[PDB]
Amino acid sequence: AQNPNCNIMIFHPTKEEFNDFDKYIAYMESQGAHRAGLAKIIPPKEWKARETYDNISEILIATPLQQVASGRAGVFTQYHKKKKAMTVGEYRHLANSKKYQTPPHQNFEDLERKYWKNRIYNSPIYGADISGSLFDENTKQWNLGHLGTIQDLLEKECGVVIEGVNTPYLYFGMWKTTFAWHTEDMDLYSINYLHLGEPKTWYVVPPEHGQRLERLARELFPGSSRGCGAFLRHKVALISPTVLKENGIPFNRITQEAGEFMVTFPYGYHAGFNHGFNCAEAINFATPRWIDYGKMASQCSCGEARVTFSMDAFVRILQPERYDLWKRGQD
Numbered sequence: 001a002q003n004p005n006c007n008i009m010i011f012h013p014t015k016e017e018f019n020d021f022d023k024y025i026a027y028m029e030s031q032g033a034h035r036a037g038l039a040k041i042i043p044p045k046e047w048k049a050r051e052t053y054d055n056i057s058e059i060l061i062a063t064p065l066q067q068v069a070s071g072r073a074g075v076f077t078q079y080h081k082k083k084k085a086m087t088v089g090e091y092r093h094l095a096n097s098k099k100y101q102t103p104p105h106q107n108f109e110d111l112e113r114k115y116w117k118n119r120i121y122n123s124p125i126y127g128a129d130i131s132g133s134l135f136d137e138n139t140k141q142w143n144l145g146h147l148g149t150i151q152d153l154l155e156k157e158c159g160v161v162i163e164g165v166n167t168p169y170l171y172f173g174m175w176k177t178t179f180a181w182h183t184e185d186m187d188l189y190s191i192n193y194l195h196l197g198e199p200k201t202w203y204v205v206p207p208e209h210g211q212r213l214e215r216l217a218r219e220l221f222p223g224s225s226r227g228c229g230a231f232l233r234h235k236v237a238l239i240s241p242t243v244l245k246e247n248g249i250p251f252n253r254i255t256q257e258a259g260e261f262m263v264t265f266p267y268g269y270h271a272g273f274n275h276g277f278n279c280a281e282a283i284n285f286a287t288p289r290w291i292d293y294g295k296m297a298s299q300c301s302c303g304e305a306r307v308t309f310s311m312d313a314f315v316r317i318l319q320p321e322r323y324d325l326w327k328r329g330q331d
């Protein structure tokens, strides 16, 4: 068995290996990368996503989100308070202000210490989930707006044609902006490219151990657990590495820098934080190996998780017994 300790693997494809996206994902899995739940891909030195980032300031963040925490430093939830619209140039200036800017630090480990000590005492503002792309149309390799669609994969594997579309999303971050513990919708893959700015630190639980994280979460968030049998689908709960270690939960960590891709694998729980002003692009995708995970994915039916149009068909075809209840949740 390849990668039996489920370590995060880092890949350096050549420009020739960067041509065929599906083939390279399958290669990474042949080396055991999926066992970690997360892999890093450093693009060949010849590649670029676009020529410059000098002209992005007029992108609008229609609904910036202030991430307000409740709980203790290592075990907290966050809710998202909607703020007034602002441009990316306006948001960058805000991120760099004395109130929000990254503090002085020695190295990534010192900054990580400061994050977990102090996150709950601040409310950073995140520009999340903005439909769009920063890849140039002429970038032919690993262009996250030109991937094979999940609808087409389901049709290729299972023969059923379904409605729905699959487009990327932009994220503009600042110091302490936080992504809560989650797997993807329908336990899909994700791919995330950090276009510019400061790093993103990730934490991940191997897919084979995901239920250990879920059992801890039910213990740590007991009210939320009674409310919903899949409350991590709400994407609001944080648990620190110290607390994970105290409870014996297997996990790994890695820091993504500008110019690097991360891939999350089916049923790989992940969480993390931004180091300072940055911009990322991410999208979900599927492979043949995903289908069995899609069929077994948990679902939120309490009404909180509310998701895209295109998840309807995935539930309807892969999970017909659950469909009626899940759709009641959506309506």
Ligand SMILES: O=C(O)CNC(=O)C(=O)O
Pocket (backbone or CB within 6 Å): 171, 178, 179, 190, 191, 192, 200, 264, 270, 280, 282, 283
């Ligand atoms: O970058 C973020 O805020 C969160 N991203 C992801 O969870 C992802 O790419 O799967």
Ligand SMILES: [Mg+2]
Pocket (backbone or CB within 6 Å): 055, 056, 057, 058, 059
């Ligand atoms: Mg612009």
Ligand code: NI
Pocket (backbone or CB within 6 Å): 182, 183, 184, 190, 264, 270
């Ligand atoms: Ni994710």
Ligand SMILES: [Zn+2]
Pocket (backbone or CB within 6 Å): 227, 228, 229, 230, 231, 233, 234, 300, 301, 302, 303, 304, 305
């Ligand atoms: Zn729910």
